Amino acid sequence: MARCERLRGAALRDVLGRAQGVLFDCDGVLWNGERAVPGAPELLERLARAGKAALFVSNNSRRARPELALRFARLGFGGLRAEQLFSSALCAARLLRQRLPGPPGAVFVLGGEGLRAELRAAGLRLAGDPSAGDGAAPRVRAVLVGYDEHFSFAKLREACAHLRDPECLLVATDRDPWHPLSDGSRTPGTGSLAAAVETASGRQALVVGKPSPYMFECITENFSIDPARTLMVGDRLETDILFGHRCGMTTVLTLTGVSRLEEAQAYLAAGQHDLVPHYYVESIADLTEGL
Amino acid sequence: MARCERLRGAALRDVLGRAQGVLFDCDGVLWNGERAVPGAPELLERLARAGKAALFVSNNSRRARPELALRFARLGFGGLRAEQLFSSALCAARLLRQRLPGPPGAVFVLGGEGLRAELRAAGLRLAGDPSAGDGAAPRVRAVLVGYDEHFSFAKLREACAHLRDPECLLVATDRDPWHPLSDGSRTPGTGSLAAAVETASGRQALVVGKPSPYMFECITENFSIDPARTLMVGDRLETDILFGHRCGMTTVLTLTGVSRLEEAQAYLAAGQHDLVPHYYVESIADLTEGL
Ligand SMILES: [Mg+2]
Ligand SMILES: [Mg+2]
Ligand SMILES: [Mg+2]
Ligand SMILES: [Mg+2]
């Protein structure tokens, strides 16, 4: 059980020695903006060399996988199989193929061109893609809320019209409320657009990304992993740490991102055990030592 | 205590005889869309004749008072003093004048031209009104969320930038999630835009409209009313009925609008006493009899 222990010395070595695999969140962990965490590529190099599986779990729904993979090599993370990378965009598309109801249905998407590429790559028909001949607009059977920078009250109204049908799915890529920018400003996240959609429609979204356990289901379609033998490394307690707890993983908080150690200990004193990390490190560069 | 009694016979007569005043909600009560509830103007006529004060309490933030008053005469409700009409737009403006912090501050508004007129009529300086000379844009000290049909992710981002300052007020006109249209469709309400703003900013809005007690404070600046001797008539349990309970008023549900009797009795069996009306009537036309 999580007691927010600084991960070091012999403990660090046993924890890493025993682990078969590490799941990493990206922003606030491997990098912040245009800047790699110094020593982060070297940890990834050293884990591969130790024969430990590294995978990446992101709530990003802005970019399709091939462009998400770009960011890795660009910030010094070479040698990555794009199969190592799981985003809310990819997993939302998979979940939609799995669950889309109706006869052997179009998805109305709140989101950008990257998200759309991803959904189409999975065989999904999107509302507002061109119609066959001059036949009817296909029946909309899911509403997907992603990171939509061009969100408007009109799209909100349209989403709710589709959701009047109770057989129409409501799905969210993630519930991230906001995102820190390099210049100290914040950007609204998908969770804020999902809150608007949920309120106006009176529905609860099915959530794809962390802390939803479905993100783990998604990862373990392509890979067997023993979550008991898997570390989850993230910077955000309500997302990455909570997720790791829900999956039965050992959790590690890195202090290079959103959450402060102060908050992690707050929650422990308040006995909120699934928002408490098992370990914390100043930065993931402190983990290389144990290898 | 509210036991959802059909209001009739001698009971109706004592309830109306004793009451010094009636507060009416508008949509779903006096009218639906372009259509007056038959017998609703006649109830208003008869109440005035009995010497009972009628006032109107609306969560509408779309239209300034002089245009809100138009709708009354237009749907058969002549003889109304605009002083009888209290909307979330008017009361938000009053609250902002009362609370705006900072030296003896601009309001950033999410809302239309009616709301803006109302705020200016109260002496408020709005962000995005033209600047003095070529001096700086004035410091924004309140964010107001109203019914904004041109809501966008960009306005959402800007609202959150202003709210980074914790001395910057967050205010909502109302939390109405959605609104029924004549054609059976629904429109997203201010509560959905307020949910987005609250999520992206991590703040809780100060709420002006029903069921907020502040709406009552607003009404009782212009009038003394004994809420113990005042009836509150509305169609929406979570707004009009809850409000009336919070104010110490006798509440009456009309079935011409949003809430169903089924839901009112549900809540009573669940012992949720402040979402239970004291009385209900099929339509407010059934109330004239008691006079
Ligand atoms: Mg992160
Ligand atoms: Mg810290
Ligand atoms: Mg109403
Ligand atoms: Mg009914």
UniProtKB/Swiss-Prot annotation, chains A, B:
Membrane topology label: Peripheral membrane protein
UniProt signal peptide: none
BP-aspect Gene Ontology terms: actin rod assembly; cellular response to ATP; dephosphorylation; positive regulation of actin filament depolymerization; protein dephosphorylation; pyridoxal phosphate catabolic process; regulation of cytokinesis; regulation of mitotic nuclear division
Activity regulation annotation text: Inhibited by NaF, Zn(2+), Ca(2+), Mn(2+) and EDTA.
GO CC, alphabetical: cell-cell junction; cytoplasm; cytoskeleton; cytosol; glutamatergic synapse; lamellipodium membrane; postsynapse; ruffle membrane
Residues that bind Mg(2+): 25, 27, 235
GO molecular function: heat shock protein binding; magnesium ion binding; phosphoprotein phosphatase activity; protein homodimerization activity; protein serine/threonine phosphatase activity; pyridoxal phosphatase activity
Effect of residue 25 to N: Abolishes protein phosphatase activity
Cofactor or coenzyme needed: Mg(2+)
Major subcellular location class: cytoplasm
PANTHER family: 4-NITROPHENYLPHOSPHATASE-RELATED, CHRONOPHIN
Family (UniProt): Belongs to the HAD-like hydrolase superfamily.
Protein name: Chronophin
Source species taxonomy: Eukaryota, Metazoa, Chordata, Craniata, Vertebrata
